Amino acid sequence: GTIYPRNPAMYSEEARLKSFQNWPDYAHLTPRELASAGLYYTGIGDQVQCFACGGKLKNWEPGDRAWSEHRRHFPNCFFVLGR
């Protein structure tokens, strides 16, 4: 293909959801919302990564939404642009 995901295994939303098993208790966004936006947990802090573009986000703040943060920071991601 002409595009290729940074993490093919995390292609699956269910695989992304499972990655949040040890998502920290202070991290306010839900695994549901994050996984739906393409994001999976890297295992460090509140840091997540997109399976598609490979961008990483951390230090979530109140009012942040997963999709709007993903699109603001990585607007050329194919998952963002395929939504």
Partner: peptide, 4 residues
Amino acid sequence: SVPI
């Protein structure tokens, strides 16, 4: 949030 911020990018890494």
